[PDB]
Paper text:
A number of enzymes, termed fructosyl amino acid oxidase (FAOX), have reactivity for fructosyl amino acids as major substrates. Some of these enzymes, which also exhibit reactivity for fructosyl dipeptides as F-VH are specifically termed fructosyl peptide oxidase (FPOX). AnFPOX-15, which featured 11 amino acid replacements in AnFPOX-1 exhibited significant F-VH oxidation activity, whereas reactivity for longer fructosyl peptides such as fructosyl tripeptide (F-3P, Fru-VHL), fructosyl tetrapeptide (F-4P, Fru-VHLT) and F-6P was never observed. The overall structure of AnFPOX-15 consisted of two domains: an oxidoreductase FAD-binding domain with the topology of an incomplete anti-parallel β-barrel (two β-sheets with eight β-strands) and four α-helices at one side of the β-barrel; and a catalytic domain with two β-sheets (eight or two β-strands), and two long α-helices (helix 2 and 3) that locate at each side of the sheets, and some short helices.
The first-generation mutants, in which R61 was replaced with glycine or alanine, displayed significant oxidation activities for F-6P. To confirm the structural influence of the [name] mutation, the crystal structure of AnFPOX-15 [name] was determined. Ligand-free AnFPOX-15 [name] and AnFPOX-15 [name]/FSA structures were crystallised under similar condition as those used for AnFPOX-15, and the structures were determined via molecular replacement using coordinates of AnFPOX-15 as the initial model. No other significant structural differences were found between AnFPOX-15 and AnFPOX-15 [name] (rmsd = 0.148 Å for 431 Cα atoms). As well as in the case of AnFPOX-15, no significant structural difference was observed between the ligand-free AnFPOX-15 [name] and AnFPOX-15 [name]/FSA (rmsd = 0.17 Å for 431 Cα atoms). From these observations, the generated [name] mutant acquired significant oxidation activity for F-6P, and the wider space of substrate gate in [name] mutant was confirmed via its crystal structure.
Residue numbers in the entry: 4 to 433
Write the structure that this text describes.
């Protein structure tokens, strides 16, 4: 480990920073690790560059249970990550027939895991029970609502946690490249047959050589190399509203509130800011782009970066749905002004499992992407398994789920309600 050189492409991001962290913990020599990201860690265009994220339980795919438990343990006990986890719990709510059904079935799925999750997860069938966990609601507001309360979760101070990894990496003497000298252009090969990767070249022409390369470029991964449409990148949206300390006080330590027909909000941070998201299948930004491995040009959804273009917001349609979420959850704040309107990018696989594997042809080159919009929670632990993969030690439960799988389904729809619409058809964000 001490004599192996690793390049982590996108190391200023969620899966990338986690990987560089666990390389250091595993005893890799800091000077042998090179983080290449367009932006310095925490990357300003990273999906994890956010006031907060939700930490919650999900049992959709096979490794999800173990990954979640693994992450929880670390969010609660790892001194590096512990300050950034706010265990206020989460309550999912609904008042529709289909919505309440989904809540009940979800609850039952937790039980069917058979590990005792009913001890920290509760079905709330009455108004009183809902108001008890979320005193800021009014009784009239929640008429007909049912709730599912998960006591294990809460929210995460996202950018702060990635910055915490970054501080450590830099203290340790990890090598960095940012800007054009940090922006992956193509991999380097020993022979023209392309079967042995020996490094990467960035868009400025700078070459970096290493034993192994990890591609953790999030929503950009599919643009940089050909993933054969395994990964379709999509934008989700959020707005902010600012509360006074007096307005914020009713929401202190209140659970994350979610409703699948509206979206979610998180309690005001130390500055009185509430972030609100809607729920929708996402937006693509289609372009032709020549990834490598294609390397002919190919239509791929390419992120329109808010970091490189701060004057971008979100479509008009998103303004509507975000305001509906605010009316649903926070009607007393309907006249609050929305601001820091922005788009946040992820990349979906067909089955919403990760794409974490060695490239089929380019040995030495490893993919660590396919976050599918639900992987910030895995910040503390995902790097441990990326390292296991590098070392040939990744267990089958993860390896099989994360394997190279082109043609395994339509990633444009993925596991969501619909194929994503494209930003070219949604006016207002420019
Ligand atoms: C968008 C979004 C996502 C999200 C969320 C809400 C929104 C609005 N809420 C979540 C939640 O409540 N709970 C949760 O678990 N996840 C939530 N998410 C998803 C989460 O943000 C993403 O799953 C995760 O952050 C993605 O990580 P990933 O590592 O995959 O992506 P990234 O963090 O963006 O990192 C990518 C890095 O790559 C760098 N980059 C890009 N191009 C290059 C090149 N060419 N060379 C080098 N680096 C490159 C980017 O800069 C970035 O740093």
């Amino acid at each position: 480990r001490a004599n192996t050189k690793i390049i982590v492409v996108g190391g200023g991001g969620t899966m990338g920073s986690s990987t560089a962290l666990h390389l250091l913990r595993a005893g890799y020599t800091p000077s042998n690790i090179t983080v290449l990201d367009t932006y310095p860690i925490p990357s300003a265009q990273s999906a994890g560059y956010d006031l907060n994220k939700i930490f919650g339980i999900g049992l959709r795919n096979k490794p999800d249970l173990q990954l979640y438990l693994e992450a929880l343990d670390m969010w609660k006990n790892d001194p590096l990550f512990k300050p950034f986890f706010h265990n206020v719990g989460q309550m999912d709510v609904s008042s529709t027939e289909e919505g309440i059904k989904k809540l009940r079935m979800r609850y039952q799925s937790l039980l069917d895991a058979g590990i005792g999750l009913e001890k920290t997860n509760f079905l709330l069938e009455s108004e009183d029970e809902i108001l008890a966990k979320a005193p800021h609601f009014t009784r009239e507001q929640i008429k007909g609502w049912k709730g599912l309360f998960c006591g294990d979760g809460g929210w995460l101070a996202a950018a702060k946690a990635i910055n915490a990894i970054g501080q450590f990496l830099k203290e340790q003497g990890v090598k960095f490249g940012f800007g054009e000298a940090g922006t992956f252009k193509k991999p380097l090969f020993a022979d023209a047959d392309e079967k042995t990767c020996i490094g990467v070249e960035t868009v400025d022409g700078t070459k970096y050589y290493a034993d192994k390369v990890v591609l953790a470029a999030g929503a950009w991964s599919s643009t940089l190399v050909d993933l054969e449409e395994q990964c379709v990148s999509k934008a989700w949206v959020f707005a902010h509203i600012q509360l006074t300390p007096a307005e914020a006080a009713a929401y202190k330590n209140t659970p994350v509130i979610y409703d699948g027909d509206y979206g979610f909000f998180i309690e005001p941070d130390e500055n009185g800011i509430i972030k609100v998201c809607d729920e929708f299948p996402g937006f693509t930004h289609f372009k032709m782009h020549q990834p490598y491995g294609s390397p002919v040009p190919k239509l791929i959804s390419v992120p329109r970066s808010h970091a490189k273009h701060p004057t971008d917001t979100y479509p008009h349609a998103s303004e509507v749905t975000i305001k509906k979420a605010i009316n649903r959850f926070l009607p007393r704040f309907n006249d609050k002004e929305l601001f820091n309107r922005a788009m946040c990018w992820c990349t979906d696989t067909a089955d919403a499992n990760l794409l974490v594997c060695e490239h089929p042809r380019w040995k030495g080159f490893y993919l660590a992407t396919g976050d599918s919009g639900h992987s910030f929670k895995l910040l503390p632990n995902i790097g441990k398994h990326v390292v296991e993969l590098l070392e040939g030690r990744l267990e089958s439960v993860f390896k099989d789920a994360w394997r190279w799988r082109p043609g395994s389904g339509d990633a444009l729809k993925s596991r969501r309600a619909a194929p994503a619409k494209d930003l070219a058809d949604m006016p207002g964000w420019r």
